[PDB]
Write a protein that binds this DNA or RNA. Structure first.
Ligand SMILES: [K+]
Ligand SMILES: [Mg+2]
Ligand SMILES: [Mg+2]
Length: 272
DNA sequence: AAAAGCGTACGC
DNA sequence: AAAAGCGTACGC
């Protein structure tokens, strides 16, 4: 049987409907049960958000800094819908704690908890299934670890790394995200370098650490000039996007005792 | 011009 | 509340 790890806040938006009125807390938990059955899960762990990553904030103070601006500029109707939706999501998450191992850690993102759980107990299961729409969770794909997205309704396997993210493997995916950044997370990338130029540069010169050694790179294009002045940006971004490497550091950032407790809690779940 | 990179609206 | 989301289509 399998392990299933749910990105719970991410999953909540499956029930955001501008037209619908009623609570979804019971239907939220039933959906997780249904997913558990679809992915043959003997163990399901649900993860929630609880603040911006203290780790990522320490390396990039503007991490998700667009949030408070984006939420301030919502219309009257959007604010009213959101306040209902988020009240309902809180109740859904409460009700979920009755039934499944359900984790928040203050100042730690679900991403880091998921990455750590996979490495900690994933080998005790036949397969691990990740329930998230978030594409950078594919930094955790292996032959034994896959992802399902409710928005796209797609399954994502390691063999399909290229078809999805236009890269060969996890390391290339990490290198490309570090170069490109992520506007949604307010992580600046190298100006003028997107997916096409980024992949072309990675395939020629290698992964981000190799590219930094060779700086300045040759070429007279404006985006290469921007790349050659971006050493500090590239190192910083690598720490922000390399989920497998820094997941434990991200949990430890909020306290050694928090890491200790979470480690024990996860190992106890696997024994049940 | 063209593509690329870029910015934004919206469904679930 | 340093609360509170993703990918996608789409147009310049
Ligand atoms: K179209
Ligand atoms: Mg998240
Ligand atoms: Mg995104």
């Amino acid at each position: 049987r399998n392990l299933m790890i749910v990105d719970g806040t991410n999953l909540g938006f499956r029930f955001k409907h501008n037209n619908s009125k009623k609570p979804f807390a019971s239907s939220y938990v039933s959906t997780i049960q249904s997913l558990a059955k679809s992915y043959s899960a003997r163990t399901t762990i649900v993860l929630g958000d609880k603040g911006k990553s203290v780790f990522r904030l320490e390396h990039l103070p503007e991490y998700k800094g667009n949030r408070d601006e984006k939420y301030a500029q919502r219309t009257e109707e959007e604010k009213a819908l959101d306040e209902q939706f988020f009240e309902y999501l809180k109740d859904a998450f409460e009700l979920c704690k009755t039934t499944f191992p359900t984790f928040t850690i203050r100042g730690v993102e679900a991403d880091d908890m998921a990455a750590y759980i996979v490495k900690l107990i994933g080998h005790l299961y036949d397969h691990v299934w990740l329930i998230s729409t978030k594409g950078d969770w594919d930094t955790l794909l292996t032959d034994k670890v896959s992802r399902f997205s409710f928005t796209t309704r797609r399954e994502y396997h390691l063999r399909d790394m290229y078809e999805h993210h236009n890269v060969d493997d996890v390391e290339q995916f990490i290198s490309l995200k570090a170069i490109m950044g992520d506007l949604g997370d307010n992580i600046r990338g190298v100006e003028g370098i997107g997916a096409k130029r980024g992949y072309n540069i990675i395939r020629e010169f290698g992964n981000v650490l190799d590219i930094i050694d060779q700086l300045p790179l040759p070429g007279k294009q404006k985006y290469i000039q921007n790349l050659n002045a971006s050493e500090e940006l590239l190192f910083r971004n690598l720490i922000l996007v390399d989920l497998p490497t820094y997941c434990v550091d991200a949990i430890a950032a909020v306290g050694q005792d928090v890491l200790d407790k979470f480690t024990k809690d996860i190992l106890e779940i696997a024994e049940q």
